[model samples]
Target: MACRNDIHRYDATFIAIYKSLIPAEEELEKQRQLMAHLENLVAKEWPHAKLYLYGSCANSFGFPKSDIDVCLAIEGDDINKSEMLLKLAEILESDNLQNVQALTRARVPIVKLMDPVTGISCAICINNVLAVVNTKLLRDYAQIDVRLRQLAFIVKHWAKSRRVNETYQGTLSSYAYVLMCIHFLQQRRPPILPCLQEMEPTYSVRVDNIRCTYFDNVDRLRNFGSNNRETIAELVWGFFNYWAYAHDYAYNVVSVRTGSILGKREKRHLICIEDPFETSHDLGRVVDKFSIRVLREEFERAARIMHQDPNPCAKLLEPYIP
Candidate 1:
């Protein structure tokens, strides 16, 4: 490619940043205690709400300095309920309530809590908040369908695999590739990215926004080369990383490509998040410590609690087909 040097240089920089963030594992009991404490207090006011400890802090490689990510699911009006929730967070923070930092937000409030004595950082969120809290009027929320769920499982593994190999293979950065996949699925179009079960034909190539065209291609993503933190963070955080396995689909050994690069131009390179990729480590730890049993129980229990109330987003897990 004529732009090989530029691509390689950018790729090197991304990897360098990643290498600099190699995370040290945090104490598991510390995280558990914090969640337990939050749950104990929150349930007293809104006993019907469900609490979940999601993201990296719930997993194995969680670091001492990393922020904890938690999600809570309350049974009623999320927007109306946020005021009370915010008040609870305020109280928790001011009281030096064991491991909580000042509550913060962008589209939603991310409670930045102090690290437990174990020295691991932590944070929290409420489920349905994505559907109800900050995005209340900004965007329409819909059930994440099965096909999309399948795509999520596939992308999760692809990201993990790419990390192990450390080479640029496509035109779009890893986060962009994932976002395009999610956008297409969320929009209910044919999944632009191939499913993990599918194979990349020899003629197929992956292209970023600049080189993207729909004709005869499996997938395409808008270029996200601005390399802005918000772009990368939103792309990663928005879709909940393709790394975790959800229900029917989980990470596996098979590799698949969902798009193609066209023309005789030398192949454009794909960018990967560097080693000790914080998000990946975060996801890994979140899944391991949260335990599938707990997830099922929480989701089911949340469903039961919501069943007693008139909730607009009650059926969080009923089957949804794309």
Candidate 2:
């Protein structure tokens, strides 16, 4: 039997509530110094490793005292070597927490490194191969944004039509409509450009120009624009409808958007979930954070709406597999 995929789920409702209640603040100098020290230690120990700063800390979206997320990408073989380096991180954790009160808060450090030779990766369970592969897929998809000026144009128009006349209720959010157009383009053999698509009996939909009349949908804007359940759920379901059937996909791929947590993917379905700020936390970090029942509900709901395209899921699955 194939290895069962370990699904990663996050509590959207709890996260939304807690995040809203989370107070804001300037960057802590002490925290910054501690993070720098940790990065240096990782570099010293693993000379071949590449260290990157991400999440709220890197984005400057931290609260008064927030955790620092550090990612390490080591180039070599030997999972044992990766494990030893991880143990070395404990020293930084101990030194950083000294003298701090329980309520004073703790500095969290996350380490992720892969053996270049063996290709074995480590970290919080969320950093597994599946998660990383999914992230690379989403990043590739988002790159289309650059060439998608026309696609963005069509979506903006669809949004405008709905704004002026509220009769166009096709379950298509503004972003969803854009993604549909993208899927259609990818379906073509030659693959039409965002603005150009008139070659060899194209199966893709054609548009005159991406320019559309501008109008605002304030309420829809609030719901889908932010990281709320209504929004994430809609996007998740919409993605499944648009691409799941067209792509035999894997589940629980990890990716990061705004915070430290990796965004989990179920094939075309991408959930806006966050893992704890760091990988030091176990897989339970995601489990304890989100309710499995709710996550299942969302996944199933999305699956039910899946729409099959002429281009089978098997063909689309190749680009996503690592």
Candidate 3:
């Protein structure tokens, strides 16, 4: 729409974003050291257990200095998380950590810790292994196209700026934003991404009774999304346009698994982002009667800027305070 002649600006600014927004090599080294440091502590205590970084740290979608999310995976389904987290909290607190809080009562319980050494806080949880599996899934997707990373990074910080990237405050997580990017590309006319599960199982795992599987041979799909010549500017506009005006909130849900906007389920939600692996888990369930409104209004604000603003690159990046 408004980005036709202004595509140059989007392209220019986005290249600038990709050039500068990625964490530096030393920044990555610091993250690596912290991951190793935590794993060392955990292994000293529980020899058999593994400490895997799940979120942005493991996934290439991460921004610099983002908080760390590690899973202290004790595989037994019957194991208690509160007791385990308390034990973890005690162990971490013994180190040069600060304000280690074992939030056992949280929806997904985590032991939050601050590393004064690195000046980054980390949250460790038990048995969120699906995240680890899916972390690799999205990371693999990141290899297929550079656009996904560039587009997602742009969209993510916009959400962060608008303050909708706050799951604790009842909004979508960064995970949800990445899926939105994938889902949008998959639905693109020429099909930028394939539904990994719809194909044969090159990558497979047993997560409970459900045999979790997907096509991870992304190298073969390297030339995918090639036919769609939509530029970054086109994509950014289309992304917000779909969410703001095109999405049928009443009937449709986004499913990264199916690569389709799914029909509404039995448990209805005003905004449904169906988790690809766990079908019953609505990412939008965190939205109540109120936050959904706030989220939609933000979408409208983004869409408005993209649609009407002459210099949308600057206006889009304009910070929202409220």
Candidate 4:
């Protein structure tokens, strides 16, 4: 995330690990060019449809080589999702090892395929727009500080290698991990990221009848975190330490929305992550009881390593073999 000759180049170990996770071709404009090209192809298959990328691709927090979720927002009073999927499969084209299959019986129906051009896998679901706004939240946050991106990218890399990044199989998500990093940075004493509570909304939207507002115009506050000179290693050490020792699972809930921890809304409980836009939706809802312990064990292990390991750059991300 931090290019060479940039500020905060002092943390050599962490910097090397962060750079290893992403490829050389990663740029905001280039990634968008592929997305824009992909969008044009989608237009031929289905008109009156606009693609809104939510996950890693849109947010810049994702591993460039990883798969992502995108939403196809189509305007209509009455829509036939299943039929649409059927039609999409007819015109789909990609030279991947597999065909584009529309899983209508899926928990959330999606037409799954590779990006035809770049072979970047995608799941185009119908109108999952909240994540699109969430896409904006992290994208906007990255502009304010380079550390948020660096911190999140490394955590995601660790989560992947350690095999704890599976959400469908009852673990955390890359999405949840990024949110935790943002909140962790915000909780710093001098604060790496502002809570955005004090500032009035420059951007607001209603999705699923829920109002999402935030201080989107973060340009004025670029110097906000300049006062806190916390390096990536310290932030990484603090992140695991807080979760391993400081976080109160039984009583506390981390909300990126309010920018403060709140009481259990059980409602949503146990490793609760209050979705900023979807207040009622706890992102940790997928984390089950057994996996809860698995996560804690992993956290404590990392926390100890961060605190005690003499030279623990890759040790922190060592592959977790079964």
Candidate 5:
């Protein structure tokens, strides 16, 4: 019934494996001149410190040696994230910048480094700034389509080749696998996406008091999903068969700010994922029951290698050895 030339040769082999995991416009202009040389060395020590770029290199779902995630934004509330990450690691180890650690017991307090003139690898956390307004709401929902950055770059390159994307190794977090590929393209069926917080607001902001509105219009939704003709290889086999046999791992919840599923009650982590605007932030609360059975046996071994592999997306991106 649907084999438009083998889904256009697996959507041109998933856009040539998401254009070999992006990240090179001179390595994103040398990470934008190393995030403007660490925001001019933290604006010479907090002269209203402002540096923002959050996870996955500003959330375009990074990969080409991805590491940098800066975010300093300051405005005092008795500021002292471990004394500003040990004074931003002694001013990035006196501008020499190499393994300049300051992880004041991390869970967000950061400031790790390594640049060696843009060999990249950074992290700088301080005043979070709601992770730079949720990394501009995932770079405005990855600029409305282009198959949500080709299905969040082949499901974050098959969750970093099945090592389960490690949020401190408890699994889940390339920002919870790009919000589970934007809540499975906003629960498809003629909806490749739309619920940018139920549209209409155009813009708004608040931050600490948390107001944050949305609807950045996204170029008038650019023909949304074109009535879902489904093809990035049948949307990556219906995104690993909707999280392996239609999810509901004990009480639904995959909510892209109420784009759909949300019932939740029985918890202790079996995968919930709802943090669109940190609505009580449970980005799978670091999945624990044996990493949710190794992320549901790697989503049932990538839905049985996308339903019986012959080379199904290269054996469903074979790599996991851990």
Candidate 6:
């Protein structure tokens, strides 16, 4: 891959945009209090049900006003997700939570509500232990290199702006985009980040019979990406260029668990993003042909803008109207 020296020219724009997207400390504190409040409410009825923060919010990749994701970890095999969500929704409604709704028919059954006091929207899923574990893994990965967060934030913002971050619309999730960024970093010549799964395992946990293990020695790997001098602009440009021209969409699967690309034959999907622990789970299963076309077109658009536009950051992130 050829390197461009002019890529550093957009450094100021990247820093400005990244700073604007980070969540505020006060909002984060409010989210913590909201979680605690919900936990207390749930514990009152189901004493063994433990609530956990998951997804982007817990992984430290969330925007300022992103909806909070909570997992309700209840013990035993007798629990029904549909029934639990219905009951949970009723309880939250009784507690005066706003916009309480039980979406039992959803692919993942969840009780959605908004905190009246903090105005934070939240979705509570039943017994999604894998989500909690993955959240911790993402957090650990973020702690290894500050650039992962910066690149992820800008990529997520671009995805959101381009209207391609909507999972329900057959595109990708913030989780998938973050993994893409991680894989890109790992593929760098000097490698901006080490493959945690390849290192000695420092953390291990079993949930639902699946053994999750990864290197948690992030403090030891603090200097992991220091040798790589590529600025955020260069990384962002490379990200779009790779997706647009280099990635083998027909055959390659991005896997953070193994920290290597896998074959699509393992699990057939238009786009394959292996769930770190749940090897069978394809995070990109939701992507359809139409969405794939849109995603590719958007990547090409961003790549062209980065290469030719004078004000690349502003034009590249311009929101898609459709």
Better of 3 and 6 by lDDT: 6
Instruction: Summarize candidate 2's per-residue lDDT along 1-322 as a digit string, tens digits.
Output: 1111211122253234334433343334544455565566666766665555443233222222344444555544444533554565454355442322211113333343332322322232112222232222222333433223233332333234323112132122333333344444433333331221111222222122221111122222222212222222222334444333433223432212221123244211332222212222222223222333333343343345222222222221222111
Tens-digit lDDT track for model 3 on 204-239? 887776567898999999999899888887788889
TM-score of each: 0.34, 0.29, 0.84, 0.85, 0.34, 0.87
State which candidate, 2 or 5, has the greater TM-score: 5
- Candidate 4 local distance difference test against the native: 0.79
Candidate 6: misplaced stretches above 4 Å? Answer: 41-48, 80-109, 265-268
Error of 4 at 150 (Å): 0.9
lDDT, candidate 1, 112-201, per-residue tens: 566445454656665533322112111111122222323333333333432321123212233333333444343222332232212332
lDDT value, residue 8 of candidate 4: 40
Task: Please report how far candidate 1 places residue 78 from its true position, in Å.
Answer: 5.5
Name the lDDT value of residue 236 in candidate 3. Answer: 87
Candidate numbers sorted by TM-score from highest down:
6, 4, 3, 5, 1, 2
Cα lDDT tens digits, model 6, 114-188, are: 887998899989888998998988888899888899999999999999999998999999989998888888888
Clashing pairs in 3: none
Which numbered prediction scores highest in TM-score against the true structure? 6
lDDT of each: 0.36, 0.33, 0.83, 0.79, 0.81, 0.88
TM-score of 3: 0.84
lDDT of 2: 0.33
Worst 10-residue lDDT window, candidate 4: 1-10
Summed over model 4, clashes come to 1
CA error at residue 205 for candidate 3, angstroms: 2.3
- In candidate 4, which residue ranges exceed 4 Å CA deviation? 1-10, 26-31, 41-48, 66-68, 85-100, 105-107, 113-117, 265-268
Ranking by lDDT: 6, 3, 5, 4, 1, 2
Every model: Cα RMSD to truth: 21.7, 19.3, 3.1, 4.8, 18.0, 2.8
